[PDB]
Nucleic acid binder design. Sequence first.
RNA 1: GUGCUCGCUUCGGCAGCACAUAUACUAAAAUUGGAACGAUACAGAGAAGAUUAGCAUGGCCCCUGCGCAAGGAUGACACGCAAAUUCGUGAAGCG
RNA 2: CUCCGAACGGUAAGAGCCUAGCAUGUAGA
Lengths: 320, 249, 52, 271, 23
Amino acid sequence: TMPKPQWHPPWKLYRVISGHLGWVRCIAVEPGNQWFVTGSADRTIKIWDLASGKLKLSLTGHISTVRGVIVSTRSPYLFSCGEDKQVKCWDLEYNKVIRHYHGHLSAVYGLDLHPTIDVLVTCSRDSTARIWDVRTKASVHTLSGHTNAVATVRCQAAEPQIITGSHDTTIRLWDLVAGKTRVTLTNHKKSVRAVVLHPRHYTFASGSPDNIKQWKFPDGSFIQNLSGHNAIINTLTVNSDGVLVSGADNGTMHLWDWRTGYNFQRVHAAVQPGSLDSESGIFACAFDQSESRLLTAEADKTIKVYREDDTATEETHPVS
Amino acid sequence: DEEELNDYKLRKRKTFEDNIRKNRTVISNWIKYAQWEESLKEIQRARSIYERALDVDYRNITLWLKYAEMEMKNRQVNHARNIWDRAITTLPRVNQFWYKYTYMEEMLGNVAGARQVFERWMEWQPEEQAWHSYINFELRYKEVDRARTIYERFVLVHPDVKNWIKYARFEEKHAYFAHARKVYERAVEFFGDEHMDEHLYVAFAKFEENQKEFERVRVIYKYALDRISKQELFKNYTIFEKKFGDRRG
Amino acid sequence: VTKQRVESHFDLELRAAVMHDILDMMPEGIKQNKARTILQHLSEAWRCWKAN
Amino acid sequence: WEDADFPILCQTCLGENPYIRMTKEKYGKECKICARPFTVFRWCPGVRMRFKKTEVCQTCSKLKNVCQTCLLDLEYGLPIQVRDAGLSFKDDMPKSDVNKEYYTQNMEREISNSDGTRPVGMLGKATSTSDMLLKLARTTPYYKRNRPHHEKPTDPDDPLADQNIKDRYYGINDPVADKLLKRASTMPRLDPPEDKTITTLYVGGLGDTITETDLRNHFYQFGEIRTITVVQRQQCAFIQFATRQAAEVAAEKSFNKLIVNGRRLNVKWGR
Amino acid sequence: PPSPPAPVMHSPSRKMTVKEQQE
RNA sequence: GUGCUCGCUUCGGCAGCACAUAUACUAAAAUUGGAACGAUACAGAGAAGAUUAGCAUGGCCCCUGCGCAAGGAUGACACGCAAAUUCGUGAAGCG
RNA sequence: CUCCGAACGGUAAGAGCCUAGCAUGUAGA
């Protein structure tokens, strides 16, 4: 029912970090694969060297969980956002807050910086999202309409520029400038938390308890229903070679190929020493810039780092 | 009457309105108001109620059904058609809606519009039971070509050998043994060596038995078991017993 | 958020996070799993952790 | 954001000049009814005329389709009281502040989801014409209105001077409509007979061009007719109709309008 | 009054057995 | 009103042409109707108040204040809504 | 020796009765 799926070598766990004192809610990578940022519910924000796996820095911004961060590739800025109703921006030469965009009403849940228009787009459990001027603390649009907490946003240059998925189980595509709803999709049954945009196929996938779904831009054409990783899914991350990663809620991490939707690996990770298994979980993922290694921030205060498997061949690992 | 019933009307109107006022929730009070005013046969008032509750919650199928049935009872055919098309436009998966709607098409008698609604419906590829309600409709009139075209699209939208076997049985029942032999041949062609299984080839042996071609029955049975997956134990045994039946009978 | 409402706030955020997560995943108690009762059991589990 | 790129006004509020220069100021003022910021149009209704503006939300202009700068029915030129009372339309636009503003914004959402040419709601559903509305209608352009409000100023004892815009729109206490409604109540109409058994229609002035053929041809629309007796002696035609409801409909219909071959023949009760 | 509700392009439910109905 | 016609053709009149393109809540407003912690006078901390907690939800609102300061002062009968058998009914499907 | 402070964190309690500076500038006949 499909052309024979390609062969991607599996992934093996090799390096494990344990430095936080709470859940690790979000994690991002620096433009040049030298260091990655972590934001936790311990309220810290910790910068780590990507090579030596050593904690380069820690900074005590928030008042509660840091629910999401993002590093600027057009500046030495780093934007944090947390359930303290507030969003902050750090200069990373002087390591300090430089402006704070007030305005939301409840816990921010996630955010993204638009690659070319210098704005932020942040989603919040207050049933909205907003578009922020970078510098001047100006919000141009309250992208509104989701009947509940806008569980995530991703933004991109092309039309449409803003996709937001929610606990209303809907997905919504917005025109940025008029700040208006353009299109809705409502295929899902259970809330939808993870949306990811392909780098070179003008497409995007959304995850929910039921299973992943795939769509074609700019319209919202359903494509290809991906099933198999039946667990509350928390982040989707896609790689250069079409490797697509779904981190589930309960630790079970699943891999597939983007083209055929071929679930070709299940990794089922082991918790730290002191953590009961029931505290297992995955909360965010990110491939490095060079896309060789993979970071995953788990729900037991640890950051696990997987590497492409080098000893893999078609016979070591056949495709079926 | 004149004023003593007007009193009754003001009272109970305000009672219903106050109840749904305090609540804004469950359409129990809504629907009871709908029936209060359909028993008063103030159809426009009860329809306004219906639309207000539609705005309250547009997602109640029994609410839409109350609407449609009231329209059928008070003969407002065009408005019932309006309601019907609105629903099925809004909830393509509530097959209660398509079912009762094409039922309405049959009641009004417009088999043409019945066909059209069934057509818009099959676009959602609803389900085997939907295609089969479609085919029972199409066979309340002869329409044999339409029948087999329904079957042909159906067994491809739900490409199940069992659906194909229902197609084959319909072919036999309507005496198209030519097209039915072609049904089974094309069916094994499509299902291919990869995944095909017992029931199809036992069915082909049995059809050819009824055609009294025992030699071809046996070439079918053995050549198929050799070409495809064979074995496991209960399958081999039942197939061998059906082959014994094909030989003897 | 200010040191007064830190506790009440974080509590609100926690209870609601619980509601979202499970009582959108665990159902198939679809009507309402008596979430309110599952949250009563939450509170009781806490109490008992506090009292060993 | 209430935004009109067109004005909703009859020729009466428009002005006599076929070439009108009109400026628009978006959100220049809130709706006096809706409190909604809408585009106000400023244009000179003439040389030596008042340079007027459009002041209502397109909600308010659309729902009751009153010429926004005339507040007059764009089809009837008539005040809201006369218009609604002639179409028997008791328009219960709520009086409260919350209901007024919210319902005006709601009829505005309904206007934007409607074609914007035909009114959204119940009054736009009673397009059943009124003969008394035709009688009250002024089909001439009241350009002298377009002048500003050097003459003896409006007398305070005449109940028209103090102009009540809000109630005169929302359906209460229109003085000019009250006066014209007294006029259209005292206007000539066919009073029904106390003697119930005669379906006896007299036609006075029927003339030499109308024969019994064309007379019954006009009489056909209202119901069965038993007998016809024309007198060229009195230029009259006495028709006995078969039905009482028929004769009543024929009376109200042909009273003061029926022109058979150009001339109005007096439809009167028989004697 | 917001924009009209888009059709709920949805799946059908598969009802609750006694097994998970008590589970 | 400017300027021109080898304009009628005088310098008086008429025409033709080139332009020069539409002010302005135009009203002397016609009208329309209110409140002070003011004066006096009185009077005198009038206990009745322990009303035995605070923070929320929350859009419950107004005031000072330039305030994403700061600070005032306020609403609790915030409930009964019923997962759930039992039969009956109709609809569909199979024989 | 010539370095100059500002506010808030406050003036009551009421009774009966008295008087006021304002405001707007209204389509249809």
